[PDB]
Structure 1
């Protein structure tokens, strides 16, 4: 069924400045968005900020400034950061937005009418820093900034506090069977698979009901009032999760400002999310609470939740800084190549340089220069191939198979594997070039060079197309060197081998141009 491909990041708490975690989550969101746009689909990619709640209000009180001022400023820092990082997110949502607040009230009211919200009590542990309710099994002993004996979260290690409050309760327990049915009927709905197993095991064990309001004093009045009861505020997570629904309902202008909230999500064809990108730290909220709310409201469920191995929240790592040093595309490639769904990845300067030099410069960059060199490509054009050998055909087969292979990986989604698949083809092309030695062929066998050169050019085009969501700016430079017309830089038609006809002219040269400058050890 044709709809707008809808991909999201988490919305980030504004208690603190943007750092690598948020940049990474949003980068994944952006790449998925970009790949689907490259496929020729309609796309709406969403990111933003989570601005209410005890955590933010206490950060504001520490900084000695009003929550309104504080959130607006920090939100500004997130926007600047995401502009600097050269993402292509369609909209930046803030939970302080009045249209979002309206949507939250609608959803709350819907849950209440459905009978799924009642007045009760929460008495138990709470991590303010995670805005999370915890059972006694999920806490243990530890220390605070003052070095005092306190209780901490087993999840996150943050300080926990005992809360005893009359709260509005959501009947989460009533949704256990339906959630299990959903997980089992849609075994690709949570990625990676071991995180899916975790969610299933947790829900199988049983679900308590969930507090969805707090006393207003507790949150320093910095939250959305409960409809028909201004003594209570809406739980920051029901508030926050609802952003995906709000985003799905905002008409947005050319400048990126929201201009209108539609009544019916179907009008914009975005809801529900095709992919919610999150960190492992917020899996329960997105794979248990969120769908339970949607089930209560009779709203459609998201297709995929992908949870990565990082946390969303004297060893600094600043992505803007590193991008200015090593290059923006390069840095993005590294972050997406270096790690899959684990915390198991060497993010040092040494490894960054190793991948820059080895993969980007020596494998990709070298190859681009070879097939566009005046020495080898004497006519500065795509030549017409002669007859193919069996060796030619083996390389051609790999290039033809690549789009389907990379497509599946992108759709999982598993961006690391998609990159590896493309670079496996790039290594193969390099080896082919080394065996055919086109530099010798210029004098020896011009007819044979035509064939070798054409396959090389075409291999570079196809790999680069499939890499364009990862290296958005560098892909443009490469296509410019190859003289690939704009029309051939996107669309599934152009995944096919042979889409750029012989006789196409290469792009102009530059006196000492390089794609990726190698760096010292």
Structure 2
């Protein structure tokens, strides 16, 4: 199928202000989106806020404001944050939106008509902070915000409470075999692989039915009513997960306001998601519940769920103002793969800013554009190639395919490492050929050295443009790369910018080192 590449972040609870967690998740969503745009594909990237439920209403009660005022305010803080971080998200969704609620009711009704929702009881533990049902084996002893003796979640260490309610139940138990078929048939559907193994183990152990409504009193009436039963409200997670479906059905104008909700998801060619970006703490909701609902409704399943090492639930805008926006994005994407084992100190931030961005990339951009070395201020025409020239060229030609596979996994840290390996190689080659000497001794040779250098800088910069969107534009301007050559798989190929291309005007640092 030729469809719109549909990439999502989770929608974030509005009990608290935006923070690094949310910023991180949306950054990954943004980068994936950007990579596919650079590739030349149609892209719809989605982010947003999760505004209903017990947790949000209780956060609004603490602040002595109405849930409507509170959620609207906090949503605005998330919107301002994501504008400031310089993302390129196509739409920001809110679960308070009327069109979203329509879709929730449609979906609810569909599940009901298939006999997959019945009236039942849930008697068990529940974390209000995670909005998660827990069995007794996922709880242990602990303390609260004061220090009294209570029970807590093994998942998250938040306080749990016993709940005994008549609830609408979804027949999740009936989807165990079909979920297991899905996991085995599509062995890259959950990334990384060890989290895929976690999910499969859990589903193999057995699946209880899932409570999908709560009594309206318990939610402080801050929730979507169940169709044809106003004493019950729809479970915040069914309401939340459905944002992806809603998003896939909203037509959106040139300034990002929703204007129309289509009946059939196929009209916009977005659903199902190609990638759901999530934190590790919401894996079960996305890999177990969400597909079970979709199977029940006869809707298509997402292709990939990528679960990163961070939790979903250190001020980024402050650090971006201190070290640069692109540099901060580079650091977060480079420093952490799929575990929490990463060093986010100012020491390490500066180490990578100076080491990799300034000395490796920045230096190299200045070398191939400086008037000392590139005297004609143009892309020269190469002479014949030595075997050492060819070895570097081979690396540059192989890089797009290698990075493409990493971005598609998706493993953004590995994509960056691949590019920088080539950058290190190019630097080694330059040091070796010493082109500063060649301006005097051997002009014919310098043409070849300089051309290869420029073209390596271009190709690496193209593949880095989803990570450093602003700086990539600065680099391409210095190199004098025409706009048409700054995207499209065509321009991943070696030799795309012809010799004779004039460099851009000089002024002037790309990344400046710090103490």
Shift of 1:29: 0.1
Shift of 1:146: 1.4
Q: What CA distance in whole angstroms lies between the structure 2 residues aligned with 1:376 and 1:113?
A: 73
Shift of 1:196: 0.1
- Encode CA deviations 1:386-441: one digit per residue, 9 max, x unaligned: 00000000000000000000000000000000000000000000000000000000
For residue 187 of structure 2, give the secondary structure of its aligned residue in structure 1. Answer: coil
- Encode CA deviations 1:155-175: one digit per residue, 9 max, x unaligned: 000000000000000000000
With the length of structure 2 as denominator, give the TM-score of the two structures.
1.00
Shift of 1:372: 0.1
Q: What CA distance in whole angstroms lies between the structure 1 residues aligned with 2:411 and 2:218?
A: 41
How many residues were matched structurally?
A: 515
- Encode CA deviations 1:118-140: one digit per residue, 9 max, x unaligned: 00000000000000000000000
Q: What CA distance in whole angstroms lies between the structure 1 residues aligned with 2:407 and 2:276?
A: 14
Q: What CA distance in whole angstroms lies between the structure 1 residues aligned with 2:89 and 2:160?
A: 35
Q: What CA distance in whole angstroms lies between the structure 2 residues aligned with 1:494 and 1:234?
A: 49
Instruction: Tell me the C-alpha RMSD between the 2 structures.
Output: 0.2
Q: What CA distance in whole angstroms lies between the structure 1 residues aligned with 2:392 and 2:145?
A: 60
Q: What CA distance in whole angstroms lies between the structure 2 residues aligned with 1:227 and 1:375?
A: 74
Large movers: runs of 4+ above 6 Å: none
Shift of 1:246: 0.1
- Encode CA deviations 1:1-59: one digit per residue, 9 max, x unaligned: 10000000000000000000000000000000000000000000000000000000000
- In the other structure, the counterpart of 1:342 is 339
- Encode CA deviations 1:57-95: one digit per residue, 9 max, x unaligned: 000000000000000000000000000000000000000
With the length of structure 1 as denominator, give the TM-score of the two structures.
0.99
- Encode CA deviations 1:284-319: one digit per residue, 9 max, x unaligned: 000000000000000000000000000001xxx000
Q: What CA distance in whole angstroms lies between the structure 1 residues aligned with 2:431 and 2:29?
A: 37
Asked if residue 518 in structure 1 is aligned to residue 488 in structure 2, the reply is no
For residue 310 of structure 2, give the secondary structure of its aligned residue in structure 1. Answer: coil
Q: What CA distance in whole angstroms lies between the structure 2 residues aligned with 1:509 and 1:464?
A: 19
Question: Which residue of 495, 498, 501 maps to 1:501?
Answer: 498
Shift of 1:336: 0.1
- In the other structure, the counterpart of 2:408 is 411
Shift of 1:472: 0.1
Q: What CA distance in whole angstroms lies between the structure 2 residues aligned with 1:306 and 1:83?
A: 24
Q: What CA distance in whole angstroms lies between the structure 1 residues aligned with 2:287 and 2:399?
A: 32
- Encode CA deviations 1:216-253: one digit per residue, 9 max, x unaligned: 00000000000000000000000000000000000000
For residue 88 of structure 1, give the secondary structure of its aligned residue in structure 2. Answer: coil
Q: What CA distance in whole angstroms lies between the structure 2 residues aligned with 1:383 and 1:27?
A: 38
Asked if residue 474 in structure 1 is aligned to residue 471 in structure 2, the reply is yes
Q: What CA distance in whole angstroms lies between the structure 2 residues aligned with 1:123 and 1:198?
A: 26
Structure 1, gaps ≥5 residues long = none
For residue 519 of structure 1, give the secondary structure of its aligned residue in structure 2. Answer: coil
Q: What CA distance in whole angstroms lies between the structure 2 residues aligned with 1:146 and 1:492?
A: 58
Q: What CA distance in whole angstroms lies between the structure 2 residues aligned with 1:367 and 1:160?
A: 55
Q: What CA distance in whole angstroms lies between the structure 1 residues aligned with 2:221 and 2:481?
A: 57
Q: What CA distance in whole angstroms lies between the structure 1 residues aligned with 2:185 and 2:111?
A: 24
Q: What CA distance in whole angstroms lies between the structure 1 residues aligned with 2:425 and 2:145?
A: 54
For residue 508 of structure 1, give the secondary structure of its aligned residue in structure 2. Answer: coil
For residue 107 of structure 2, give the secondary structure of its aligned residue in structure 1. Answer: helix
Structure 2, gaps ≥5 residues long = none
Q: What CA distance in whole angstroms lies between the structure 1 residues aligned with 2:501 and 2:429?
A: 23
Shift of 1:205: 0.2
